[PDB]
Design a protein around this ligand. Sequence first.
Ligand SMILES: CC(C)=CCN([C@H]1CNC[C@@H]1N(CC=C(C)C)S(=O)(=O)c1ccc(C(N)=O)cc1)S(=O)(=O)c1ccc(C(N)=O)cc1
Ligand SMILES: [Cl-]
Ligand SMILES: [Cl-]
Lengths: 99, 99
Amino acid sequence: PQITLWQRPLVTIKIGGQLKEALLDTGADDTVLEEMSLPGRWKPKMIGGIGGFIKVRQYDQILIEICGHKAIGTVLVGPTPVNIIGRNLLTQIGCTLNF
Amino acid sequence: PQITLWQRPLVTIKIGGQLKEALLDTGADDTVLEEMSLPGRWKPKMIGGIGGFIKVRQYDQILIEICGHKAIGTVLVGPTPVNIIGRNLLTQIGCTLNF
Ligand SMILES: CC(C)=CCN([C@H]1CNC[C@@H]1N(CC=C(C)C)S(=O)(=O)c1ccc(C(N)=O)cc1)S(=O)(=O)c1ccc(C(N)=O)cc1
Ligand SMILES: [Cl-]
Ligand SMILES: [Cl-]
């Protein structure tokens, strides 16, 4: 699809069998979701914004479907202001910016 | 043009004819610029991201040229390490997300 930016580009994702709403964020290197349990191994990671770093859990090689497109990759879980799909998975579904 | 997401979508912008690097950020509602001395009055504002909130100066009706496309609107000035072009101006240049 083509998605315009007059509103927040929020789309439905499916992860762990659950549907969630997440923001397509080309400003985000990584994908960060609110607290949830995911199967398999994880490790602690720090990621940061303009005024400091936060702790998240890193889960690798996770299946996630974004607006119907499949991705398998790293998902961070932690206290994010909103579920964010960042470039690690935007690249997987073939997303570009166009004008 | 088409902006890939293999790397951060950094492009050249112009403000006052001065050229700067900026990130095209579909996760940002508004545009956030590195500290610079814009003239005139501004309004205090707080914006939040992972980590928390930072104080910025809001300037209205500011012209920014984005790869040759002139947008005019609100910009927020603060200690960011990188200029961020948000939806408020991305919409004006006809920018979309496509996959
Ligand atoms: C990329 C950058 C450095 C800054 C741009 N900002 C976020 C928009 N895209 C990215 C950036 N962030 C997301 C926050 C929101 C969508 C509310 S964030 O917290 O810095 C972040 C940092 C790291 C990652 C990562 N490792 O993947 C993910 C995200 S922001 O926090 O200044 C910002 C906040 C608010 C506004 C607004 N209200 O108008 C506008 C901008
Ligand atoms: Cl990944
Ligand atoms: Cl505006």
